Scaffold this motif. Structure first.
Motif, PDB file in Angstrom:
ATOM      1  N   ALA A  51       3.719   3.952  -0.094  1.00 24.25           N
ATOM      2  CA  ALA A  51       4.734   4.096   0.929  1.00 24.25           C
ATOM      3  C   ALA A  51       5.793   5.105   0.504  1.00 24.25           C
ATOM      4  CB  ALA A  51       5.380   2.750   1.229  1.00 24.25           C
ATOM      5  N   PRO A  60       0.887  -1.106   0.000  1.00 20.99           N
ATOM      6  CA  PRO A  60       0.000   0.000   0.000  1.00 20.99           C
ATOM      7  C   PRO A  60       0.945   1.178   0.000  1.00 20.99           C
ATOM      8  CG  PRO A  60       0.287  -0.730   2.239  1.00 20.99           C
ATOM      9  CD  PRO A  60       1.036  -1.675   1.357  1.00 20.99           C
ATOM     10  N   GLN A  94       3.828   3.694   5.588  1.00 20.00           N
ATOM     11  CA  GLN A  94       2.633   3.976   4.772  1.00 20.00           C
ATOM     12  C   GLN A  94       2.247   5.444   4.613  1.00 20.00           C
ATOM     13  OE1 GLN A  94      -0.810   1.864   4.884  1.00 20.00           O
ATOM     14  NE2 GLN A  94       0.014  -0.130   5.575  1.00 20.00           N
TER      15      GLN A  94
END
Lengths: 271, 88
Positions: free
Chosen positions: A246, A244, A252
């Motif tokens: 980054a 996801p 993240q």
RNA sequence: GCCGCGGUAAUACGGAGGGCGCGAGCGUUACCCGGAUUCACUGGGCGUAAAGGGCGUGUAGGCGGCCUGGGGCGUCCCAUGUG
RNA sequence: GUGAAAUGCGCAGAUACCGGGAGGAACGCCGAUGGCGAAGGCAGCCACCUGGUCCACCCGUGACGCUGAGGCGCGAAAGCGUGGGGAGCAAACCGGAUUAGAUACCCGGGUAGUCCACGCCCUAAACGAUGCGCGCUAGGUCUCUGGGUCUCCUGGGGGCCGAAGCU
RNA sequence: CGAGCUAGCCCUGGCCAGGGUGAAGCUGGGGUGAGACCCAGUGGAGGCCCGAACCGGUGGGGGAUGCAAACCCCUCGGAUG
RNA sequence: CGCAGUGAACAGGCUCUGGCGACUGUUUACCAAAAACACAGCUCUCUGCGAACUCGUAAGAGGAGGUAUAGGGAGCGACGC
RNA sequence: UCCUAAGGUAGCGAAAUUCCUUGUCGGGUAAGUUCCGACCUGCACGAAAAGCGUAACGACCGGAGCGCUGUCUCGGCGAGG
């Protein structure tokens, strides 16, 4: 007002510049207080620690006043509105009766010739500075200290303001430019009005140089690098992150909150 | 607004013979005064379309007349226009 | 030709008998005017039939109260040339 | 909450009640078959700028008029651009219902949008479905607004019934 | 041990022959109720154009125990950013 | 007056139509200059200031002598729809 | 009617994506596995790892003309190192 250009060149088609009605009749800055040479330098002890910073027009620094409680009771005339390279808002040079001169981050409305003054006494009008307690609940106001006697920290970006929302003991409720609702101490000064040069948001940079003139180096996307280089890096021909998103550092960057949980700044904030 | 005095002064200042309250030459200078005063207003309140209508109605009147004035008399037609500043 | 005719009793189809019209002609098709006051000057209209411009401001243009004279272009009359 | 329901919210403390605060939109009663505006259209209160209109006085100009191809401006709502705002409501969109089916009607949510500014857009059952100006041709009835030596007379506007006439 | 190559940034200096195009703003006229706008004239903008220096390295040929451990020739890209 | 006048030298071949990338730019020094990276601009997200974030065992410093119209991270990559 | 968390909208479509494929129709040529315009049964497009377009830009990759040529039919002669 924002000058727009005719398209005698691509790029100069999308580019727009500021009006300079703002400031008129004063450009060369105030040799006296104004200048310390400003130190260009895009990192600390060796290593770059802000990526993509560097280049951009050589620049002198104007030394402004962010603590007006020195000059309590002494009024000053607003002598000129001039250009500041070092921030989005414009600045006003004002001569104190005192003789002494200084630069204030120029609030909206403010016009050459006005007299302006700071104290608990002060009239509740443009440019005047006051403890937050002696400012009427509802007025908008900028260049706000956060702790008393520490200097103006809030509301200095071009066209910003805060609004007095309520009282509460030694403290006073404040709606910030973010939308946050924060108690600030009563003695924390603030200058009535908002900031002005509020067209500032609407400059259309216009091309990729210019971005360079303001010392902003090109920013290379994550995927666009290789795996050594970045989390997104890699992938045979073009890629979809792969969960996801980054930062280069890995942590993240879609939705993850970063502010410290047990901060004593808490209890003062409410949004 | 336009006061009693400002009105009269214009009138006694443009008459053909003291007492003359109508007359082409004066009627004009009335509107001119109203117009500029109005001209000036719409320049701030651009969005006031209703009041703009009236202006266009006066503007005509003024014209209407001036054409009469010019038809009968070229002499004191210059006089008025020049000693009043119109023709655009 | 238009309204329509023929679905087992058709004066409308086809033949027949008779009958009407016109006649060295009689029919059809094409096209012009007419009927069409259906582009309306003579001679039509626009609330609901097709038809009022969403509403103002004004240019050109069209049109113009009462009375007195000057001209006589429109207008009328006379003669004459032409037609 | 409905037709009855269900979705949905609620013992993690809702609904119902009280106090303190935030924010946006729209202005109850007055309010009407009322008023203003060329039209679209315009409604809490205050102040400022400003348009049109009406009455009276018969003072002035002396036909300076009517209409208007084209031009020019305004033009509800929806919609578009940039930026601000966003409580309520709500196309789309999603859930529950109903139904053969239900891309609907009803219910629970909900995004633009609705609002501000600035600039576009130019349409409409933009309707009185009735272009503008003038003169002329019974009156009755109630109403708004002015002027009168004010049971009434006169002027301007808004409805109803109707002479002649038109259809 | 190395940033006397190379990459970035910082401080202070120096360089870009000559041609072309002609934005905005002014001025003037026209326009209107005022405007918008349109016209000349002036003006001199730009990751503007042609093209040396300078920077490069597109295509082809040559070189290939080379002139060279990346060179030569013709051609080509940028050339106030 | 010649066959010939930019008489030598420097000195653009043009057109129609697709695909990709908006654009000037950047790159594999030394086989790839591109449809790759960059880019103005769009969105999401974090950060209230001893900011988040980065370098550092720390002290420290960048961020920034900035303060939400501002700073970090991420993706798409003028513009139109 | 069965399954799913829900079953691809707009717009594109034999495409830098189509295996069958040189799909099929049309254009272009004396003759076109390339090209261009269409039709979809899209093996295996599709919305911000964006969707579909787009003036201008390009030492980017494809397809046609015209001009001109030792590229070629097909080679010949000459200069210099």
């Amino acid at each position: 007002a924002v000058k727009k250009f005719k398209p005698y060149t691509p790029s100069r088609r999308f580019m727009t510049v500021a009006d300079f009605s703002e400031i008129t009749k004063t450009e060369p800055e105030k040799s006296l207080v104004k200048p310390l040479k400003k130190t260009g330098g895009r990192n600390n002890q060796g290593r770059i620690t802000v990526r993509f910073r560097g280049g951009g027009h050589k620049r002198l620094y104007r030394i402004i006043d962010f603590k007006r409680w020195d000059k309590v009771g002494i009024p000053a005339k607003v002598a000129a509105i001039e250009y500041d390279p070092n921030r989005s808002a414009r600045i006003a040079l004002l001569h104190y009766v005192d003789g002494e001169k200084r630069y204030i981050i120029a609030p909206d409305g403010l016009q050459v010739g006005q007299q302006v003054v700071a104290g608990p006494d002060a009239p509740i009008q443009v440019g005047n500075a006051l403890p937050l307690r002696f400012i009427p609940v509802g007025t908008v106001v900028h260049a706000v200290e956060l702790e008393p006697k520490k200097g103006a920290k809030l509301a200095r970006a071009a066209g910003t303001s805060a609004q007095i929302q309520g009282r509460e003991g030694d403290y006073v409720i404040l709606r910030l430019p973010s939308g946050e609702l924060r108690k600030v101490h009563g003695e924390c000064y603030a200058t009535v009005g908002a900031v002005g040069n509020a067209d500032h948001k609407n400059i259309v940079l216009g091309k990729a140089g210019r971005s360079r003139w303001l010392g902003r180096r090109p920013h290379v996307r994550g995927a666009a690098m290789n795996p050594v280089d970045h989390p997104h890096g890699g992938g045979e021909g073009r890629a979809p992150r792969g969960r996801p998103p980054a930062s280069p550092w890995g942590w993240q960057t879609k939705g993850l909150k970063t502010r410290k949980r047990r901060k004593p700044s808490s209890r003062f904030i409410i949004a | 607004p336009i006061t009693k005095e400002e009105k009269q002064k214009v009138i006694q200042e443009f008459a053909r013979f003291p007492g003359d309250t109508g007359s082409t030459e004066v009627q004009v200078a009335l509107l001119t005064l109203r117009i500029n005063r109005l001209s000036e207003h719409l320049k701030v309140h651009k969005k006031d379309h209703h009041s703009h209508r009236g202006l266009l109605m006066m503007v005509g009147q003024r014209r209407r007349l001036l054409r009469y004035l010019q038809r009968e008399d070229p002499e004191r037609y210059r006089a008025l226009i020049e000693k009043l500043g119109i023709r655009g």
